[PDB]
Each structure stands twice: as structure tokens, then as C-alpha cells.
Amino acid sequence: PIVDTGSVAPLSAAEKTKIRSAWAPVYSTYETSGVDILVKFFTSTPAAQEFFPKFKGLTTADELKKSADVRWHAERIINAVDDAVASMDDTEKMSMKLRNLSGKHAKSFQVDPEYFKVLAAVIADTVAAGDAGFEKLMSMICILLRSAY
Amino acid sequence: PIVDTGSVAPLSAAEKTKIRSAWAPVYSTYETSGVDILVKFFTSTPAAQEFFPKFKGLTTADELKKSADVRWHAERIINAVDDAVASMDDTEKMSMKLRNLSGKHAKSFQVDPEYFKVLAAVIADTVAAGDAGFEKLMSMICILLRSAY
Numbered sequence A, B: 001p002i003v004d005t006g007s008v009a010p011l012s013a014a015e016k017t018k019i020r021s022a023w024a025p026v027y028s029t030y031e032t033s034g035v036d037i038l039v040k041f042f043t044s045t046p047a048a049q050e051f052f053p054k055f056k057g058l059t060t061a062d063e064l065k066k067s068a069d070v071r072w073h074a075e076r077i078i079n080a081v082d083d084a085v086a087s088m089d090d091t092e093k094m095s096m097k098l099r100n101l102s103g104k105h106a107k108s109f110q111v112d113p114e115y116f117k118v119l120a121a122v123i124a125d126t127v128a129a130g131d132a133g134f135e136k137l138m139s140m141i142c143i144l145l146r147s148a149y
């Protein structure tokens, strides 16, 4: 499954190709996919809801999907993942960008780090459920998002 | 008209109210509005086109509107304006955020500063053409976007 500690083996050329292929369709309509992913996560994980101050009041999927706040947040998250996919060949660049992001989550947003892998799980499930390559990528992302904690 | 140098008088309580009212509808569907605004600007201002490297190839509105790159850029711009609107009562916060943005445009993106007021004009025209209050807000934004040049 998706891990958020330790280390994972590098991505093989074959895994990268599989990932790019599976990701493309999802990213094409990122504003729709991203919202579905965030909404699904938010609704099925009550404990995490307190970390989204701007969502106070919204409870049903309909309320959420109509909120510009929800859409903007979802679009930013989905695009951060997109940047990681585009940087799979440049692991150094991928790290820098995510380390910076980790700092924001730890110092400014103050979000509980345990939820990174939960949302990542939803993303993986939507893009290519069961694919070990994508799970590896998600794990890399989660490990880096926790680096500043 | 919109200016990008000097200084403009503070926004009066009345002007802020007018702005919030006119902005709300537009922001509700920011991903559509934003794209229309960016596309309109891009197509009617050939000189500026060279500053959008990722748009090379796209020439017609249809090609542009279908590009995820165009959509993402448009969504980021429209939201930067939204942040300014939401910070009208905290001029200090508005400045910090825009000064940071100015730096990116000057050091990393290398865009010609003369085009800020041209795009701002399109935004104003769409939201509330003729409103002096909105023009004042747009001028404040443009002046701050040029601060790092």
C-alpha cells in the first residue's frame, strides 16, 4: 500500500510509462477529476474535515462541488501531483518543490500529516487502482510531504 | 482608465461594496470567466503572445480554450485578483502578496511590465465596465505588480 515513512525503490522506466498513460486522461479534465477526488476524501473522512476551515458549513457533495473555495483547493492539489508526474525523470526537482510544500503544510496550514496517505490513496484509486507503480509514486510524494514535520 | 505608476486614492467603503457585488457573479464561475478573459486578451494583443511560451501553436480561441495549460494559467490569474478583492480591507496583506508576485514576473517569468494594465483593462471591462471603483482596484494591482521592476 501507500507508505509515508522510510524509503521506496526508484521508479523503473516501465512504471513511469504506465503512470504517464494512466494520468493523462485524468489530468485532461483536472478541474472535474480533482473536485471529485477531494470531495470523496472529505466526505468519507470526518476526522480530517476540521483542517479545511474554509469548508465549514458545506456537508453534502452538492454544496461542496458548487463552492469556488472547494474547486480552487482541489485544482491546486491535483496540479501539485501533476508537477510530480512531469518531474519523474528529475527526482531532484521533484524533491525541491515538494519539500517547499511540506513546509507550508507544517508551518502555515498546520495540517495533521497522517492524512496525506489517505488522500493519496483516493487519488491512486481513481487514476489506476491496484497499479504498484502509481502507489510507489504516491508514496514518494507522501514521504516528501512529511519531511518538514 | 487604469494606471500603472504613481499612486491612487484609497478605496471608499461605497466603492468596495460595489466591487464585491460586481465580482461575486464572475468569480462563481471563475474557470469559465478566467479563460474568456485570458483568451480575449491573448488574441487581441499579438505583441504579448511571445510571453506565453506554453501557448506556442495555439492560435484560435477554440485551440486555446481546450488547452489545459491555458486553463490553468487563467485560473491562477483570476484567483490572484480574487485574493486582492478579498483583501481590500487589509491593504498591508494585499501588498505583500502582490509584491511577491511582482518578483516572480520580473525575475522568473521575464514578462514585459507594460502589459499588466492591458490585461487588467480586459478584466475590468468584463466585471463592471465603466466603474471607477473597480478601475481604482485594478490600478492598485498594476502598480504593485510593477514594484519589483
Ligand code: HEM
Binding pocket: A048, A051, A052, A053, A073, A076, A077, A080, A081, A101, A104, A105, A109, A111, A112, A115, A116, A117, A119, A120, A141, A145
Ligand atoms: C497528497 C496530497 C496533497 C497535496 C499534493 C497537497 C497540495 C496542496 C497545494 C499545492 C496547496 C496550495 C498551497 C498554496 O496555495 O501555496 C495545498 C494547500 C492546502 N492543503 Fe494540501 N495537499 C495535499 C494533502 C492535503 C491534506 C490531506 C490536507 C488536509 C488534512 C491538506 C490541506 C491543505 C490546506 C488547508 C491547504 C490550504 C488551503 C487554503 O487555505 O487556500 N492538504 N495543498
Ligand code: HEM
Binding pocket: B048, B051, B052, B053, B073, B076, B077, B080, B081, B101, B104, B105, B109, B111, B112, B115, B116, B117, B119, B120, B141, B145
Ligand atoms: C493583472 C494580471 C495579472 C495577474 C494578477 C497575474 C497573476 C499571475 C499568477 C498568480 C501567476 C501564477 C504564478 C505561480 O504559479 O507561482 C502568473 C503566472 C504567469 N504570468 Fe502573470 N499575471 C498577470 C498578468 C500577466 C501578463 C499580462 C502576462 C503576460 C505578458 C503574464 C504572464 C505570466 C506568465 C508567463 C506566467 C507563468 C505561467 C507558467 O509558466 O505556468 N501575467 N501570473
